[PDB]
């Protein structure tokens, strides 16, 4: 029954620049006894577990970068980093312990960069796959920025929507950018009626779709 | 040094019963409180209880959640910790964490595990089918080149890829796995300068601990 609650949800921070993110708790976290507010920080990078980094609101744990400070006090709290890294990317957690223990909602911080064109990658069928019926077509749109982006498919020079399916990373904890992957999931029987299969890649860092395909009869 | 490792995650029919373990050595376990921790793929972090350490007593105190379903314990001849979880469902598939709490001074979680993933299902088990992406001759003019393994159809995650044994770890994507058809299906690529391949040999390993599989597959010119 300590409600705990953060803000913002999410933003995106270029690197160098100061970021500030908030806590509320619905109660007092101000123990009388020993005069500490009993709210932690804790930073889980994408993919890992989430890692300590301040406790008792303002101390900074050990071996934690100079640049993130803990402040506030009673039912208000803020994490501050001072300038931006690139690998600051996680989701920031606060967690009271002043009754049991309950952590807010996260707030989530994204690293804002300059704009990057996908690299675009695409590979056909493996002979192991079709031996056994299906034929997926992959596409790889690999270290781009921002995280919107299109992709087309077309077969024999038309378009089709059935059967694919695509996936964002996290944002890369040392370039700050995003990948895609799309695949196109047809059975062998389709796969063999066509010859041509193309993926392209639609981003705002260019006019000009990026286009990559293979012909059956090429292998 | 301070070690936590869970395990004993995996798949459970909904209704079922799980109890997950948290082994720890690099400090002195009686002196320390210890929580769980879940999260569901996703979504935030959930605290779920904890069990004092020996000067209160070793009693246990639970999140309203999880209250009268489940049940924490330690053993402190071997200092480990344990969660048994009962009546299982869907809202209960997550990441478990253990974590060390309070010496009855400090107010941090100082320590975590890696966590260990539930996840709650009437699916069965499938193991994947592992592919290999090798590049199109068009594509290794260049002076970089994008190699990839497909990991098909499998059940529950996770599954875990390496390229060659871990020893190639820049310029590696993993995307996230998709479900559909209560099937997962997810591909991993890794960027090499050209001239380590096809001279030097690139191979993806994928696990999933789930069936016990393990499969290397090499990737060779098409
Ligand atoms: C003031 C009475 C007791 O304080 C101590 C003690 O001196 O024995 C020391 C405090 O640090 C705390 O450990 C309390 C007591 O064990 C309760 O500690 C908890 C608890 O519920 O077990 C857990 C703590 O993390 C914290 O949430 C305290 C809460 O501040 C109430 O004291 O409760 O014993
Ligand atoms: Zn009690």
């Known amino acids: 029954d300590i409600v705990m609650t953060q803000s913002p949800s999410s933003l995106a921070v270029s690197a160098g620049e100061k970021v500030t993110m908030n806590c509320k708790s619905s109660?007092?976290?101000?123990?009388?006894?020993?005069?500490?507010?009993?709210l932690a920080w804790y930073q889980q990078k994408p993919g890992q577990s989430p890692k300590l980094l301040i406790y008792?609101?303002?101390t900074r744990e050990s071996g934690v970068p100079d640049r993130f400070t803990g402040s506030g006090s009673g039912t208000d709290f803020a994490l501050t980093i001072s300038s931006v890294q690139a690998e600051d990317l996680a989701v920031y957690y606060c967690?009271?312990?002043?009754?049991?223990?309950?952590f807010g909602g996260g707030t989530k911080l994204e690293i804002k960069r300059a704009d990057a064109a996908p690299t675009v990658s695409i590979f056909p069928p493996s002979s192991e796959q079709l031996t056994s019926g299906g034929a997926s077509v992959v596409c790889f749109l690999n270290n781009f920025y921002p995280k919107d982006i299109n992709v087309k498919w077309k077969i024999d020079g038309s378009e089709r929507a059935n059967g694919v399916l695509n996936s964002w990373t996290d944002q890369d904890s040392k370039d700050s950018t995003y990948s895609m992957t799309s695949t196109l999931t047809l059975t062998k029987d389709e796969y063999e009626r066509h010859n041509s299969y193309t993926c392209e890649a639609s981003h705002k860092t260019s006019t000009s779709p990026i286009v990559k395909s293979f012909n059956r009869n090429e292998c | 040094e301070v070690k936590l490792v869970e395990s004993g995650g995996g798949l459970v029919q909904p209704g079922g019963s799980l109890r997950l373990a948290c082994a720890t050595s690099?400090?002195?376990?009686?002196?320390?409180?210890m929580s769980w921790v879940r999260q569901p793929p996703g979504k935030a972090l959930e605290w779920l209880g904890f069990?004092?350490?020996?000067?209160?007593?070793?009693?246990?105190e639970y999140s309203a959640s999880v209250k009268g379903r489940f049940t924490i314990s330690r053993d402190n001849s071997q200092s480990s910790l344990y969660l048994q979880m009962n009546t299982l469902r869907a809202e209960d598939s997550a990441t478990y964490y253990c974590?060390?709490?309070?010496?009855?001074?400090?107010?941090?979680?100082?320590?975590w595990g890696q966590g260990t993933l539930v996840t709650v299902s009437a699916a069965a088990t499938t193991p994947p089918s592992v592919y290999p992406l090798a590049p199109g001759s068009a594509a290794q003019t260049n002076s970089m080149v994008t190699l990839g393994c497909l990991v098909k159809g499998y059940f529950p995650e996770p599954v875990t890829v390496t390229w060659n044994s871990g020893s190639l770890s820049t310029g590696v994507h993993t995307f996230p796995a998709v479900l559909s058809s209560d099937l997962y299906t997810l591909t991993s690529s890794v960027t090499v300068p050209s001239k380590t391949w096809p001279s030097e040999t690139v191979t993806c390993n994928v696990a999933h601990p789930a069936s016990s599989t393990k499969v290397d597959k090499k990737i060779v010119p098409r």
């Open positions: 974590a060390r709490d309070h010496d009855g001074y400090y107010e941090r979680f100082a320590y």
């Open positions: 690099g400090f002195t376990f009686t002196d320390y409180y």
């Open positions: 069990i004092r350490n020996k000067a209160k007593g070793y009693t246990t």
């Open positions: 109660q007092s976290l101000l123990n009388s006894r020993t005069r500490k507010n009993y």
């Open positions: 008792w609101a303002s």
């Open positions: 967690k009271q312990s002043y009754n049991l223990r309950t």
